[PDB]
Design an enzyme around this catalytic site. Structure first.
Site, PDB file in Angstrom:
ATOM      1  N   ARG A 102      10.788  33.411  25.283  1.00  0.00           N
ATOM      2  CA  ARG A 102      11.868  32.696  25.954  1.00  0.00           C
ATOM      3  C   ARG A 102      13.126  32.892  25.109  1.00  0.00           C
ATOM      4  NH1 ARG A 102      12.093  28.110  29.892  1.00  0.00           N
ATOM      5  NH2 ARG A 102      13.915  26.792  29.410  1.00  0.00           N
ATOM      6  N   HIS A 129      14.228  34.331  35.609  1.00  0.00           N
ATOM      7  CA  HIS A 129      13.226  33.326  35.311  1.00  0.00           C
ATOM      8  C   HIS A 129      12.102  33.476  36.285  1.00  0.00           C
ATOM      9  CE1 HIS A 129      11.375  30.018  33.501  1.00  0.00           C
ATOM     10  NE2 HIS A 129      12.096  28.989  33.975  1.00  0.00           N
ATOM     11  N   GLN A 132       9.219  30.689  37.049  1.00  0.00           N
ATOM     12  CA  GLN A 132       9.581  29.512  37.831  1.00  0.00           C
ATOM     13  C   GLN A 132       9.661  29.815  39.324  1.00  0.00           C
ATOM     14  OE1 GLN A 132      10.091  26.007  36.772  1.00  0.00           O
ATOM     15  NE2 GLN A 132       9.502  26.222  38.930  1.00  0.00           N
ATOM     16  N   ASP A 218      20.111  24.357  40.996  1.00  0.00           N
ATOM     17  CA  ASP A 218      19.828  24.272  39.574  1.00  0.00           C
ATOM     18  C   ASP A 218      21.042  23.673  38.871  1.00  0.00           C
ATOM     19  OD1 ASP A 218      18.423  24.452  37.265  1.00  0.00           O
ATOM     20  OD2 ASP A 218      18.449  26.655  37.141  1.00  0.00           O
ATOM     21  N   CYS A 246      14.308  23.499  39.732  1.00  0.00           N
ATOM     22  CA  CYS A 246      13.737  23.802  38.429  1.00  0.00           C
ATOM     23  C   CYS A 246      14.239  22.900  37.313  1.00  0.00           C
ATOM     24  CB  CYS A 246      14.204  25.171  37.938  1.00  0.00           C
ATOM     25  SG  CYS A 246      13.682  25.581  36.256  1.00  0.00           S
ATOM     26  N   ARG A 274       3.928  25.472  37.271  1.00  0.00           N
ATOM     27  CA  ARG A 274       4.150  26.451  36.210  1.00  0.00           C
ATOM     28  C   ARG A 274       2.846  26.676  35.434  1.00  0.00           C
ATOM     29  NH1 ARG A 274       9.315  27.056  34.182  1.00  0.00           N
ATOM     30  NH2 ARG A 274       8.300  28.262  32.508  1.00  0.00           N
TER      31      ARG A 274
END
Lengths: 290, 290
Positions: A102, A129, A132, A218, A246, A274
């Site tokens: 990450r 991402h 997700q 988001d 998310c 997830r």
């Protein structure tokens, strides 16, 4: 060696398999069935951007598969700065079986992957991402059935989530309808021209939500105000539309309490998922198809 | 406590589940996946009629599920003779988790079951052989799809296999066509009148095989001669008909080498599948549906 760096790294066929495995492994999870295909296997979790949520999801996930995650985070250096990318990739991939990173830049995880002996998973970059969006799509299947031909509305800033959704729309063949504030639009340089047929841009986010089966946003301000997902905006979507976000979320910014805490919101299930898609990912990258 | 003493002990719904579990567990078997739902569980195998084949199938099966089978066979006595039925049932079911009995009389296994604290499986009596018909039907699914509405032909003596097939025909709704030598016909006293609509008796076994999807027989002599399943008889069935025979087989008696060793015979797969259906049985009787 296959990696999972961008959503488009997997084919339609790959996703059909992984999504089905996700449901199967989740059922084993809910049945307290012991399944340890990854016994004695190690995941290196390289965090250069912090998230307990994602540490938990990967860490608990590989444990449940019989393996072990090692948390690797440094305060004062990072890959490509103060740590040599190849040195880390060569050494770490000699010790473990799979790696999750990450970080900030896609170029860095890509360069790392190029020198890794084992599969590398993108746990989030500034650009994409994929884990997700995968969880988001699994969550949709669970609640509403296959996403194919369905309409997903994106309202908000053009950020890693949006670019990932665009890739997903092409591969899984659904319709993406997106709207951003005028100065935070898609960077046409970072969008594959081949995906143009699968998304449409709207000046009005309320129009983008008309006939949507999934509405999502988001975190990003004085400019984003018309791009707040509120209950009037949600009313434009299909009656049984799902709302995804998310996490984390800022209530009163991108989204209202009324929506994210309302009856269409599946944000908790979506966060939970997830864990389940990432277990299917790891199983698939290490074992392939059964 | 549920038992498995006759084919008709399970409903259509039960069979749909068990047959699907059979395929799932067989895939885990073929994938060398470790699955031990029956860890620390014991099966008492009470053999009063000998079969290594069936000892192997039950014994290897529970091992693969994480449990253990105990082989219990005596030379000079048997249940209901020289051993008290209840005494054995009360004590054995206090020590183990599941019991299989292979014996002569249904009345004996039934009386045993009535005093057992744990599930009892019929591994074969003179009256019924539900585990084999189950394996036979699973084998059909594997090779030809669901058996519903299909035509099964029975040629030969009216024996435990036939009475079991009759029960199966009713429950799974397929058509049974049977033919026996004139003096070895169905004992109308041992056949539920409710199953009459699901089978038909033919004087000529060649007629019974016309349009059959499955042709099957068993060991029985000067009288059975026209009831030998040969290649001309098989030619009356559908071109892709399967031939099943519950082992052992006597080539040149009930069946020709040409048929049982021919391209329509699935007798080895059919024998193998005892292992797989019996694992699904044990899982189901001990754990129920997932």
């Amino acid at each position: 060696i296959r990696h999972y760096l961008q959503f488009k790294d997997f084919s339609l066929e790959d996703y059909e398999y992984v999504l089905e495995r996700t449901g199967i492994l989740k059922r084993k999870f809910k049945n307290y069935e012991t399944y340890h295909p990854l016994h004695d296997r190690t995941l290196a979790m390289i965090f250069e951007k912090s998230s307990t949520r994602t540490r938990l999801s990967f860490e608990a996930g590989i444990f449940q598969l019989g393996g072990h995650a090692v948390f690797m985070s440094t305060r004062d250096t990072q890959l490509g700065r103060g740590e040599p990318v190849e040195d880390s990739a060569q050494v770490i991939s000699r010790m473990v079986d799979i790696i999750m990173i990450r970080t900030f830049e896609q170029d860095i995880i890509q360069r790392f992957a190029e020198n890794s002996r084992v599969p590398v998973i993108n746990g989030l970059t500034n650009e994409y991402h994929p884990c997700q969006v995968l969880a988001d799509i699994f969550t949709y299947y669970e609640h509403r059935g296959p996403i194919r031909g369905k309409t997903v509305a994106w309202v908000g800033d053009a950020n890693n989530m949006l670019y990932t959704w665009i890739q997903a729309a092409r591969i899984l063949d659904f319709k993406l309808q997106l709207s951003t504030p005028p100065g935070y639009a898609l960077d046409a340089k970072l969008v594959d021209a081949e995906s143009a047929p699968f998304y449409q841009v709207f000046d009005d986010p309320n129009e983008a939500c008309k006939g949507a089966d999934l509405v999502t946003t988001d975190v990003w301000k004085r400019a984003f105000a018309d791009w707040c997902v509120d209950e009037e905006m949600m009313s434009h979507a299909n009656s049984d539309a799902l709302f995804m976000h998310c996490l984390p979320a800022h209530r009163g910014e991108e989204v209202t309490a009324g929506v994210i805490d309302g009856p269409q919101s599946v944000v908790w299930d979506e966060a939970e998922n997830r864990l389940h898609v990432q277990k299917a990912l790891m199983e698939f990258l290490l074992l392939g198809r059964l």
